[PDB]
Symmetry: D4
Subunit: 218 residues, 8 copies
C-alpha cells in the first residue's frame, strides 16, 4: 500500500471525479465524496483495509479542462495540504474539439495541455508525498475514431509526464480497452464519457492497483 | 463463478437491498438497481468478468419483513422466472421488536420467521437454479447488546435453512464483525442498519466471495 | 406537396418523434407537438405554405420499439383516423442489443422487426391516404461500427417495406451521413441518438423533401 | 452567404430574441441559444451548411426596449467582439404605449427610438463586419389597428436607419403580413407578439434570406 | 335584487368563469370561487348586501365550449340543485375557429352552439328559479375584426335565447365596448380574452347591474 | 373625484395593503398590486372611470408597524414622488400587544404611534397633493373585546391626526362594524385581521367613497 | 392510570387531533401521530411511564364534523379494534354555522350532533374497554361571544353523553378558560381554534389528568 | 421557579437544541423555537404558568461542537443580553471521534472541551442572572459502549464546571438512563442521539425540574 494511515489523499479532475461531490469541502461524508470512482475507492479501502486511516477529499468539478485546474490549483490543491494528489484531466480538453469544433477558445490543444499539466505536477511535487496521474479516457474501442485517437495522444503525454516526474500512473484507457473487447461502448456509457457504476468500478480498480491494492479474478 | 452467462439473478430483501431501486421493474439500468450492494455487485462483476453476461433484477422493498416477502413472492419472484434468487431478510423482523416494542403485530417472531423463510426457500428451490441466503445483520460489535443477540439468532436460522436446502450462504454479520474490530458502528451506520458506501462494499464483497469472486488484500 | 389541405398527418415513433409531446392527445398546439423534428416540420410548412391546412398529431413515445408500436397501434393510430401516417422506429430495437446486451427480451431482432413493421404497414395502408416510412438512424459515420452496421441493416428493411407497399420513404441515415462528412458525431449528439436542434432540422429537412418541399442551398 | 466561417454572429433584442437563452453567456449549446428563431437560424445553417463554422451568441433579454439595449450595449455587444450583430427591438417600446398607457416613463416614443437605435448602430459599425437590422413587428393584419399602425412607423424608421448606415435589413412585418393573408393572428400568437414555432420559423426564414440563404417553395 | 336570501347561485362557463376555482366542489370559500368576476360578484354583494344570504358555487372549467357544458350538465348543474344558473359560454366555441383553424372537430359552429345552448336553457328552466345568460365577449373594439364579428354573432344567439326563455341577460361585449372607447385591448387583455382585475370588474359590474345592483359614477 | 388623471397614488401599510404585491416596485401590473383592496380600488376605477389615467403603486409590507413605516419612508414614499399617499397602519402595533404580550419590544404603544404617524404625515404633506389616512381595524363587533377596544383608540388617534393635518380620512372600523351587524367575524376573517375578498371589498369601497366614488345600494 | 399496558388507545377527531398525522394508518412513529396534543400525550407517557406499553393510533382528519366521523367509523374505529377510544369533535359542527352561515348543509346542528355522537358512543361502548369524550372548545374568554356560547352548548352535550354512558370526560373548554384569565386568545390561537404548542400542551395536560396523570405546579 | 416574569431565557447547543428553529432570531413564535425540548419547555410553562411572562430564544445550531459555540458566542449569546443561559453541548465533540475517527480536526477532546466550556460559562456569568448547564447524552444503556463511556466523561466535566461556577445543572444522561431500564435505545432514537417526541419530553422534564417545575408520577 503506497498510502499510509493518517495521510490525506486528494482527488482532482472533471465530472468523472466530481460525481456530485459536496462543494466546496468535498470531504466529511461519502455523500460528500460523490457517487463514482472516488467514493468506490474509499469504500473498498474501508471494507478491506479499515485500519488504513486515510482521509480523502474530492475536488473534482464538472466541465473542467487542465486550464480550469490551473485556475483553482492554489485553493483546491495546495491550500489543502495533501499528502497524495490524484489527477485525472483531459477528457474535456479533447471533447470540446469534437463537440464544439468552432468554439476554439474552449479547446485545449496538446502542447498547452502537456505543459500546463506538467506545471501543476511540478508545483505540487515538492509539497507532497506523491502524485498519481490518471490518463483521460474515451469509451470507444476503435483506435481510429477521431476522438479516441486524440484521447490516446493525450494519454501518452500523461504517461511521459509521469515517467519524467516520477509520479504514479494509471492508464484508464487500457482498463476500458480490456472490457471493450466484450461490451459495445453504449453498455458502459451512452456518451462514451460518463459511465455506469461498472465504469466507475473499472476506474476504481485501476486506481487501487497502482497504489498497491490489486483486485484480480479468483 | 457459481453464476453463469445468460442467467437471471434476482435480489430480494428490505431497504438494504432496495437502495432506491426502480419500481416495479428493478432492472434495465443501474439507476434501476439502486445505489448499494446490489449495484456494486453488478458493477464489480462487469468490471472484472464482463463476459459473464448475467441479467440482474432488484426486488428489494424498504421496510419489508419476511411476512411482506411472502405476500409478494408470486409476483416479484416466481413470475420473474429467475435462475438465481438472493434473499436478505430479517433486519426489520427483529428491529420492530426493539424500535416499536408495543406494536406486536409489526413484529415477526422467530417462529414466524423460520417457518415463512423455510417455506419460501423450499417452494422456490425446484423452480430455479440456485438460492443464495444472506443473513440479516446489525452493525454492533457487542454480542450481548439485545438487538445484536437477537439478530444473531435469526442469522442461525438462515444458516440452518441454507445447510438443509443446500443453498449458498452469506454470513453478513461475520463480514461486519471483522470491520467492527477496528471501527465503532457509527463510522459505518449511525442507526446500525443503513450503512455508508463502505458498508455496502462489505456486503458486496461477502456476496461475491460466496459466488466465487473473492476480493482479498494485497 | 404530397399532403393536402384538410388532411390529418400523424407521426409515430420513439423519443426522436416524442420530443416531449402532450400525452395522450399529441395535438392542439405545438407545445403539444414537442420540441423536435415534428414541430419543425409543422412550423416550416405553416411558415412557407400557410394555406396548406394540415392537421398534425404526434404519437411518439420515448423508449418504444416496433413491438411497443404494435401494442398501441389500434388506439394511437387506427382510432385517430389519420390520412397520412409517418413511422420512424428501430433505434431502440437496435440500441438495446448494444446497451443491454444480456437483457434479450428487450431486444427486437431483425425477424421480429421486419415482420411486425411489415404487418403494421399492410394493415394500415388500406385505411389511410398514404404512409411515410422513415428509417431509424445512428449518428456515427463509421459504417463498420457495430451498432451503425446493424442500424443500416434495419434501414434496408424499412426501404424494402416502403418499395413493396408503395409508401413514401425517408432515408434519415443518408441525411446524417452527409453532415458527418464535416462534423464528428458528438457535435450533433453526445449519445449518437438524441440530437441537437440541428439534428432535428436535418430530420425535418429530410421529411419535407420526401413530401415535396425541398430546402436547398443558395 | 454574407457570413463566413470562423465569424461570430451576435443576436440582440427582447423576448422574441431571448426565448429562454442561457444568461449571461448565451452560447455554448443550443439550449443556451433558447428555443426560437435564433436557435432555428443556427440549426438550419448547421443542417444545410455544416462547413460554415460560425459561432453564434444570443444576448436577447425579455422586456427590453431600445433604452434597455443602450444600457447594456458595452458589456453585451461591444465587449463580445462580434463580427456580425443582428438587432431586433421596438416591440416593447411600442407595446407599453398600449398596454400601460398611463405609465409614460415606460414608453419609448419614435424620435428617441430612432435616435437611440441609430446611435447603437453607429457605435458598432466601425467595430464589426456588418449589422443586420430587423424590424419590430406586430402580428395583426389590420394596418389601422392603433398598435399595428404605430409599429409600422417604427419599422419604417428601422428601414431608414438601415439604408443610411448601409446595414442589412429584415422586414419582419412583411414576412408576417404574407402569412396573415391566410391565418388570423391568434393562430400564430394569442397576444400578437410571442409566436408559435411557426412564427419563429417565419423570423428565421426572413433572417436567413437576408444573409443569403433563401428558403423558397418547391 | 333579483336573487334572494337562502338561494343558491351557480356560475358555469370557461376559464373566465373558472379563474382557478376549487375542483370539483367550487364552493366553501372564495379561495374556492377563484380569483375573477365570480369572486368579485360574491364579495361586492357581501360587502354591500351582507344580509343577502346567497350561497354561490363556481363550476367554470378552463377551455370549455358549450359542447363540454352539455357533457357535464347533469353532474355539475342539475345535481347541484341550484336556484339560479348563470351561463357564460362561447369564447372557446369561437376562438378555436381562429386559433386552430384546421382542427375542425374542436370548433363549435353556430348551429351546434345555438341548438345546444338552447337545449340546456330549456331543460334547466323548469328546475330552477331563474337563469342568467351572459354573452361571450372579445376584447377588441373593431367590429370588423373577424373574430370580433363572429363573437358578436354568438352573442346575438345568446340575446335571443334569453328573450325567448325570459332569462336574465348580460351583454358583456357592450360592457367592454364602453371601456374600449378609451383603452386599447392590450391594456385589459394581451390575448383579448383573459383580462386583468379591471376586466373582471367590468364583468362583475355588468352581472350585478342585471341582478339589480347597479354601480354607477359619482 | 379627488384624484386627477396623470397623478400617482401610492398605498402604504402592512399585510392588508401588501396582499402579495411585487417587491420592490409594486407597480407595472395588477399582479404587481397584489390581490386585495389596492388592486380592487384600481380595478373599479379602471372599469368605471377608464379615462382617469392614474398611476398606482403598492408599497405595503406584511408585518409592519408604524416603526417599520418610518424606517422605509424615505425610499418607499418620498423617493417615489407621489401625488397622493394612502396610509393604513396600526393593526400590528396593537396586535403584538395581544399575541406576544411578553415581547414588549415589538409593541408600539399609543403615544409613540400617534407621534410617529403624525411625523410621517407632516414630512409628506408639503411634498404631495394630498394624504388619505385609513384607520386600522379589527374584525370584532364587541367593543369591549380588549383588542377591539385598543384598536378603536388607535383609530381615534388617526382621525385626530387627519383633522389636524387636513388629510382625507377613512374609518375602516365603521365600514366593518356595519357588516358585523349581520355576520360573525369568522365569516370575514378567521383571525379577525386578514379578510376574504368581501373584506377587501369593504376596504376598497370605504376608500373609494372618500376620494369621491361612492358605491351605494340600488 | 386508567389505561394499561398492551392496550390500544385510538384518538379520533378533526384537525386538532390530526395535526398532520400519517394517512391512513396514523401509527408506527410519532411522525405518524402528528405534531399536537396526541403526540404530546404519547411522549409525556413514554417519558414518565415508559413501562406503560400503550399502543396509540391517530385517526384525526382535518375539517371533520361528527357527521364525517359517522361516515368513517366502521373502517377507522371499529375495524382497528381499539381498547380505548378518545373522541374530540364539534369544533367544525359549530364553526361552519359562523364562518359559512348560509351553507346550511355544512352545519351540524345540535340535534344531529347529539344524536350522532350519542349513537357512536353507544355502538362503540360494548366493543371496547373504555371511551374518553373530550369537549370541543373555542379559545375565547367571553361567554357571550356567539360562537363561544354555542360551543359551550355542544360541550354540555358531550358532558351529558359521557355521564350517561359512564365514559371518561375531558372539559377542554375549562382547561382553556383557566389560561384565558391571563392571555388574550390571539396569544394561543389567531383563529381561536388552532393553537400553538402551548395550546396543545393545555389539551395534553387535560387529557392526561383524566386518565390519572396529573401535571401540577411546583 | 428560578426564572421570573419579564426575564429572557436563552438556549444554546447543537441539533438537539436547534430542532429547526428560525435563524437567526430564534424567537417570535414557537415555529421559531423549533420542534423539540425548547418548544416543549416554553409550551409547558405557558400551559401551567401562563402568568410567568418569560421570553425565550433558541440559538441552537445543528452540528455544533463547543468550538462552534465559542466562535458565535458574542453575537448569539452576549449580544442578546439574556437573563438566563442554558447550554447543552458535547454530543458532536464526542460523536466525531467515533463516526469520523480519522478526521481528527473535527474531534474536540476532553481537555479542550472542559476548558472552552468553562471559558464560555465564566465570560457569561457576570452578565446574567444565572446559567443552566445541561450534560450531553448518548441514548445507550451500556456504560461500556465506547461512545457512551466517553460521553459520561464529558458529562462529569459538565457537572464539575457547574459546581465550580455555581451554575444550575441538568444531568440529561441520568434522565435517559431511567427510561433505558425499560426501552431499547432504538425505541427513542435510531442513531442514539436525535430522539423522538418522547426523548424531547425527557429533556424538557429534566430541564424544568432544575428550574423548579417538577413533573412527577401521580
Ligand atoms: Cl466533465
Ligand atoms: Cl428496511
Ligand atoms: Cl427513445
Ligand atoms: Cl419582450
Ligand atoms: Cl377558457
Ligand atoms: Cl401584517
Ligand atoms: Cl378541523
Ligand atoms: Cl448536531
Amino acid at each position: 500500500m503506497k498510502i499510509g494511515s493518517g495521510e490525506k489523499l486528494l482527488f482532482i479532475g472533471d465530472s468523472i471525479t466530481d460525481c456530485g461531490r459536496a462543494r466546496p469541502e468535498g470531504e466529511g461524508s461519502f455523500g460528500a465524496l460523490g457517487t463514482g470512482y472516488v467514493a468506490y475507492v474509499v469504500g473498498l479501502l474501508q471494507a478491506v483495509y479499515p485500519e488504513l486511516g486515510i482521509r480523502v477529499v474530492n475536488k473534482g468539478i464538472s466541465g473542467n479542462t487542465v486550464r480550469d485546474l490551473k485556475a483553482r490549483w492554489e485553493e483546491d490543491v495546495i491550500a489543502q495540504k495533501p499528502d497524495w494528489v490524484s489527477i485525472m484531466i483531459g477528457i474535456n480538453d479533447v471533447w470540446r474539439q469534437y463537440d464544439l469544433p468552432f468554439m476554439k477558445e474552449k479547446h485545449v490543444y496538446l502542447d498547452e495541455y502537456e505543459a500546463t499539466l506538467r506545471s501543476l505536477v511540478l508545483e505540487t511535487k515538492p509539497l507532497v508525498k506523491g502524485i498519481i496521474l490518471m490518463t483521460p479516457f474515451y469509451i470507444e474501442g476503435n483506435e481510429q475514431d477521431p476522438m479516441r485517437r486524440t484521447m490516446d495522444q493525450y494519454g501518452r503525454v500523461v504517461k511521459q509526464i509521469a515517467e519524467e516526474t516520477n509520479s504514479l500512473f494509471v492508464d484508464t484507457q487500457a482498463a476500458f480497452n480490456e472490457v471493450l473487447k466484450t461490451l459495445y461502448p453504449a453498455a458502459l456509457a451512452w456518451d462514451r464519457v460518463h459511465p455506469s457504476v461498472a465504469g466507475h468500478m473499472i476506474l476504481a480498480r485501476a486506481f487501487l492497483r497502482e497504489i498497491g491494492f490489486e483486485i484480480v479474478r479468483s
